[PDB]
Design an enzyme around this catalytic site. Structure first.
Site, PDB file in Angstrom:
ATOM      1  N   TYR A  37       2.379  42.771  69.610  1.00 11.60           N
ATOM      2  CA  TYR A  37       1.501  43.534  68.894  1.00 11.60           C
ATOM      3  C   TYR A  37       1.805  43.150  67.415  1.00 11.60           C
ATOM      4  O   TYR A  37       3.107  43.329  67.132  1.00 11.60           O
ATOM      5  CB  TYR A  37       1.032  44.988  68.788  1.00 11.60           C
ATOM      6  CG  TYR A  37       0.354  45.390  70.358  1.00 11.60           C
ATOM      7  CD1 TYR A  37      -0.958  45.121  70.574  1.00 11.60           C
ATOM      8  CD2 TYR A  37       1.172  45.901  71.237  1.00 11.60           C
ATOM      9  CE1 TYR A  37      -1.400  45.325  71.673  1.00 11.60           C
ATOM     10  CE2 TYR A  37       0.727  46.143  72.451  1.00 11.60           C
ATOM     11  CZ  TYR A  37      -0.680  45.990  72.793  1.00 11.60           C
ATOM     12  OH  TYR A  37      -1.193  46.151  74.113  1.00 11.60           O
ATOM     13  N   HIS A  39      -1.862  41.376  68.656  1.00 11.30           N
ATOM     14  CA  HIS A  39      -2.268  40.396  69.609  1.00 11.30           C
ATOM     15  C   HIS A  39      -3.694  39.789  69.011  1.00 11.30           C
ATOM     16  O   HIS A  39      -4.525  40.487  68.482  1.00 11.30           O
ATOM     17  CB  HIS A  39      -2.733  40.956  70.769  1.00 11.30           C
ATOM     18  CG  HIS A  39      -2.560  40.041  72.175  1.00 11.30           C
ATOM     19  ND1 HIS A  39      -3.499  39.626  72.590  1.00 11.30           N
ATOM     20  CD2 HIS A  39      -1.322  39.872  72.740  1.00 11.30           C
ATOM     21  CE1 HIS A  39      -3.055  38.702  73.506  1.00 11.30           C
ATOM     22  NE2 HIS A  39      -1.846  39.027  73.934  1.00 11.30           N
ATOM     23  N   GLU A  57      -5.745  42.649  67.291  1.00  2.28           N
ATOM     24  CA  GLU A  57      -5.758  43.987  67.538  1.00  2.28           C
ATOM     25  C   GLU A  57      -4.301  44.538  67.299  1.00  2.28           C
ATOM     26  O   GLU A  57      -3.125  43.802  67.589  1.00  2.28           O
ATOM     27  CB  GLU A  57      -6.302  44.126  68.791  1.00  2.28           C
ATOM     28  CG  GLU A  57      -5.558  43.327  69.924  1.00  2.28           C
ATOM     29  CD  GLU A  57      -5.666  43.929  71.725  1.00  2.28           C
ATOM     30  OE1 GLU A  57      -5.224  44.758  72.002  1.00  2.28           O
ATOM     31  OE2 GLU A  57      -6.702  43.297  72.211  1.00  2.28           O
ATOM     32  N   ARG A  76      -7.388  50.592  69.597  1.00  2.00           N
ATOM     33  CA  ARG A  76      -7.100  49.434  68.824  1.00  2.00           C
ATOM     34  C   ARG A  76      -7.778  49.392  67.419  1.00  2.00           C
ATOM     35  O   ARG A  76      -9.005  49.725  67.530  1.00  2.00           O
ATOM     36  CB  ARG A  76      -7.208  48.307  69.469  1.00  2.00           C
ATOM     37  CG  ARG A  76      -6.486  48.143  71.108  1.00  2.00           C
ATOM     38  CD  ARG A  76      -5.027  47.890  70.724  1.00  2.00           C
ATOM     39  NE  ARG A  76      -4.304  47.929  71.961  1.00  2.00           N
ATOM     40  CZ  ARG A  76      -4.002  48.917  72.836  1.00  2.00           C
ATOM     41  NH1 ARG A  76      -4.072  50.457  72.360  1.00  2.00           N
ATOM     42  NH2 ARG A  76      -3.576  48.527  74.157  1.00  2.00           N
ATOM     43  N   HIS A  91     -10.167  51.937  75.096  1.00  6.36           N
ATOM     44  CA  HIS A  91     -10.224  51.656  76.686  1.00  6.36           C
ATOM     45  C   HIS A  91     -10.941  52.887  77.150  1.00  6.36           C
ATOM     46  O   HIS A  91     -11.613  53.007  78.322  1.00  6.36           O
ATOM     47  CB  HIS A  91      -8.915  51.352  77.107  1.00  6.36           C
ATOM     48  CG  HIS A  91      -8.154  50.016  76.866  1.00  6.36           C
ATOM     49  ND1 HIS A  91      -9.043  48.959  77.268  1.00  6.36           N
ATOM     50  CD2 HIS A  91      -7.168  49.491  76.280  1.00  6.36           C
ATOM     51  CE1 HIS A  91      -7.781  47.794  76.999  1.00  6.36           C
ATOM     52  NE2 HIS A  91      -6.916  48.311  76.405  1.00  6.36           N
ATOM     53  N   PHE A  99     -12.731  47.294  76.710  1.00  3.09           N
ATOM     54  CA  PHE A  99     -13.174  48.097  75.642  1.00  3.09           C
ATOM     55  C   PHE A  99     -14.488  48.535  75.468  1.00  3.09           C
ATOM     56  O   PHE A  99     -15.263  47.816  75.501  1.00  3.09           O
ATOM     57  CB  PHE A  99     -12.640  47.405  74.325  1.00  3.09           C
ATOM     58  CG  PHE A  99     -11.361  47.329  74.220  1.00  3.09           C
ATOM     59  CD1 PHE A  99     -10.335  48.194  73.765  1.00  3.09           C
ATOM     60  CD2 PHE A  99     -10.474  46.035  74.380  1.00  3.09           C
ATOM     61  CE1 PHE A  99      -8.982  48.223  73.639  1.00  3.09           C
ATOM     62  CE2 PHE A  99      -9.045  45.672  73.929  1.00  3.09           C
ATOM     63  CZ  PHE A  99      -8.379  46.768  73.740  1.00  3.09           C
TER      64      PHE A  99
HETATM   65  N1  LIG Z   1      -7.543  52.090  80.282  1.00  4.19           N
HETATM   66  C1  LIG Z   1      -6.563  51.700  79.924  1.00  4.19           C
HETATM   67  C2  LIG Z   1      -6.306  50.183  79.823  1.00  4.19           C
HETATM   68  C3  LIG Z   1      -5.124  49.802  79.366  1.00  4.19           C
HETATM   69  N2  LIG Z   1      -4.313  50.647  78.493  1.00  4.19           N
HETATM   70  C4  LIG Z   1      -2.994  49.954  77.748  1.00  4.19           C
HETATM   71  O1  LIG Z   1      -3.403  48.939  77.244  1.00  4.19           O
HETATM   72  C5  LIG Z   1      -2.232  48.345  77.063  1.00  4.19           C
HETATM   73  C6  LIG Z   1      -2.610  46.724  76.864  1.00  4.19           C
HETATM   74  O2  LIG Z   1      -4.090  46.660  76.442  1.00  4.19           O
HETATM   75  P1  LIG Z   1      -4.327  45.651  75.468  1.00  4.19           P
HETATM   76  O3  LIG Z   1      -3.704  45.693  74.308  1.00  4.19           O
HETATM   77  O4  LIG Z   1      -5.848  45.603  75.141  1.00  4.19           O
HETATM   78  O5  LIG Z   1      -4.283  44.052  75.928  1.00  4.19           O
HETATM   79  C7  LIG Z   1      -5.388  43.108  76.132  1.00  4.19           C
HETATM   80  C8  LIG Z   1      -5.260  42.261  74.804  1.00  4.19           C
HETATM   81  F1  LIG Z   1      -4.027  42.191  73.953  1.00  4.19           F
HETATM   82  C9  LIG Z   1      -5.645  41.035  75.507  1.00  4.19           C
HETATM   83  N3  LIG Z   1      -7.015  40.475  74.692  1.00  4.19           N
HETATM   84  C10 LIG Z   1      -7.225  39.330  74.045  1.00  4.19           C
HETATM   85  N4  LIG Z   1      -8.468  39.356  73.700  1.00  4.19           N
HETATM   86  C11 LIG Z   1      -9.334  40.332  74.584  1.00  4.19           C
HETATM   87  C12 LIG Z   1     -10.605  40.358  74.531  1.00  4.19           C
HETATM   88  O6  LIG Z   1     -11.393  40.091  74.158  1.00  4.19           O
HETATM   89  N5  LIG Z   1     -10.781  41.868  75.350  1.00  4.19           N
HETATM   90  C13 LIG Z   1      -9.957  42.326  76.102  1.00  4.19           C
HETATM   91  N6  LIG Z   1     -10.555  43.270  76.638  1.00  4.19           N
HETATM   92  N7  LIG Z   1      -8.615  42.006  75.980  1.00  4.19           N
HETATM   93  C14 LIG Z   1      -8.137  41.163  75.190  1.00  4.19           C
HETATM   94  O7  LIG Z   1      -5.934  41.083  76.717  1.00  4.19           O
HETATM   95  C15 LIG Z   1      -5.457  42.289  77.145  1.00  4.19           C
HETATM   96  C16 LIG Z   1      -6.337  42.723  78.246  1.00  4.19           C
HETATM   97  O8  LIG Z   1      -6.130  42.241  79.583  1.00  4.19           O
HETATM   98  C17 LIG Z   1      -1.258  48.462  78.263  1.00  4.19           C
HETATM   99  O9  LIG Z   1      -0.282  49.139  77.905  1.00  4.19           O
HETATM  100  C18 LIG Z   1      -2.119  49.581  78.936  1.00  4.19           C
HETATM  101  O10 LIG Z   1      -1.228  50.562  79.595  1.00  4.19           O
HETATM  102  C19 LIG Z   1      -4.638  51.934  78.505  1.00  4.19           C
HETATM  103  O11 LIG Z   1      -3.846  52.955  77.700  1.00  4.19           O
HETATM  104  N8  LIG Z   1      -5.805  52.548  79.158  1.00  4.19           N
END
Ligand SMILES: Nc1ccn([C@@H]2O[C@H](COP(=O)(O)O[C@H]3[C@@H](F)[C@H](n4cnc5c(=O)[nH]c(N)nc54)O[C@@H]3CO)[C@@H](O)[C@H]2O)c(=O)n1
Length: 105
Positions: A37, A39, A57, A76, A91, A99
């Site tokens: 992060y 990201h 984010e 985020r 989320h 999201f």
């Molecule tokens: N329901 C959830 C789902 C995930 N989480 C946490 O979220 C994090 C990671 O989430 P996150 O930062 O969104 O990670 C996302 C982003 F960094 C990256 N990304 C880049 N562009 C995009 C986009 O347009 N959309 C999207 N949904 N994800 C994106 O793609 C991943 C998703 O596949 C992890 O530790 C999970 O445990 C959560 O607490 N609850």
């Protein structure tokens, strides 16, 4: 002390948002990351954000401490390379790694 954004049931004050963005951005600016992060954030979801891309984010924490590693949670802060705020997303209420937007109040 109003809720700029409300993520699920979490209340973020303007100061919460600003500090998150500020952290996210200082990292972006140096080319560093903390546990991946900030990201790049594609916006596959289709949010029509008020500022232009590309977007990044950075976690915004329900305990109000600035993210500095570990579990990022569900929320985020979205910002651009000019340090402008795009919004706050989550989320919470979404199917998986997808999201939904945080509401104002
Ligand atoms: N329901 C959830 C789902 C995930 N989480 C946490 O979220 C994090 C990671 O989430 P996150 O930062 O969104 O990670 C996302 C982003 F960094 C990256 N990304 C880049 N562009 C995009 C986009 O347009 N959309 C999207 N949904 N994800 C994106 O793609 C991943 C998703 O596949 C992890 O530790 C999970 O445990 C959560 O607490 N609850």
């Amino acid at each position: 002390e109003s809720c700029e954004y409300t993520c699920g049931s979490t209340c973020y004050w303007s100061s919460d948002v600003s500090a998150a963005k500020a952290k996210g951005y200082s990292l972006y600016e140096s080319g560093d990351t903390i546990d991946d992060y900030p990201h790049e954030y594609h916006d596959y979801e289709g949010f029509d954000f008020p500022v232009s891309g590309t977007y990044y984010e950075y976690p915004i924490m329900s305990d109000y401490d600035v993210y500095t590693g570990g579990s990022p949670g569900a929320d985020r802060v979205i910002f651009n390379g000019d340090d402008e705020l795009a919004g706050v997303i989550t989320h919470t209420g979404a199917s998986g790694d997808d999201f939904v937007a945080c509401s104002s109040s």
